[PDB]
Symmetry: C3
Subunit: 118 residues, 3 copies
């Protein structure tokens, strides 16, 4: 069955502001594997990539049932992708299984949803 679901719509301007005020904001949100992908992008694409991963992790934290905080850090969640470019999540604290995720972008937002199966 389904353990939990999560949805999030993140504001591009907020992510850009936090990145502009905190020199290491991206390192706070992304894992090393995620950063390897992030570092190759333009200033604009970096913001969209980061906002989408931020939305995916907040959505995951809702499906997990705790939100981001004492029980779950942004660093405990990793978005990976298969050979076709389809994203999926790995949260070792949960299990080794792939968790369902989908991301979408607009002019002002980066949105994502997650479904964790039993």
């Amino acid at each position: 069955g389904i353990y939990g679901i999560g949805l999030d719509i993140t504001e591009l301007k907020r992510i850009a502001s936090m990145a502009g005020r905190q020199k290491r904001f991206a390192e706070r949100i992304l894992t090393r594997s995620e950063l390897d992908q992030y570092y190759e992008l333009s200033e604009k694409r970096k913001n969209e990539f980061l906002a989408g991963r931020f939305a995916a992790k907040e959505a995951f934290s809702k499906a997990f049932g705790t939100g981001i905080g004492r029980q779950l850090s942004f660093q405990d969640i990793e978005i990976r992708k298969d050979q076709n470019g389809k994203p999926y999540i790995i949260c070792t604290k949960l299990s080794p299984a792939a968790v369902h995720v989908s991301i979408t972008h607009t002019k002002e937002y980066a949105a994502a949803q997650v479904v964790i199966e039993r």
Copy 2:
């Protein structure tokens, strides 16, 4: 398996307008348990809370397969939350089981999604 899924993105300004034109709009959308939580909020938070519950119930009505109308009222759906703050839905007309739901907020919208299992 999955009985149905539902998604909704509600406009904060529309909800605020309806609440401003109808003195009992919140009572139309929310159950007594939901209102107990609503009454404790500021004018601004009330609007966001109400818009999110409205989105969650419209999303539920889509997963249910009928929409809001003759077969389903906003009063037949209740959003509850566990000790961690995770929301879930109860629709007695359907079954006593918890229905999956997730909510997210932006500057102009309150959005939600629902998944009803078999």
Copy 3:
């Protein structure tokens, strides 16, 4: 279980622009059955209908795992609806089973989500 999930938020203005620049844009995105429904709408409703179907098909392509391209065309996906107005998807290339979908509209967007079961 779940084979895949997909989410998409499409910009109404972009869809209107493509339809204004390409005389056969609707025919590119919609199947014959979908067009039969589209042709009956006003200019404004046509745009909203088309944007919602576009979002639903992009969401489906993400759940399918390939995106829209060489392995999947907009024409391979069809949104149908039951007697209550609830939409569902049929992708013959996948299987004859109904695929879960939900659509929602705002002032500037048409959004959709999809869940494909095993």
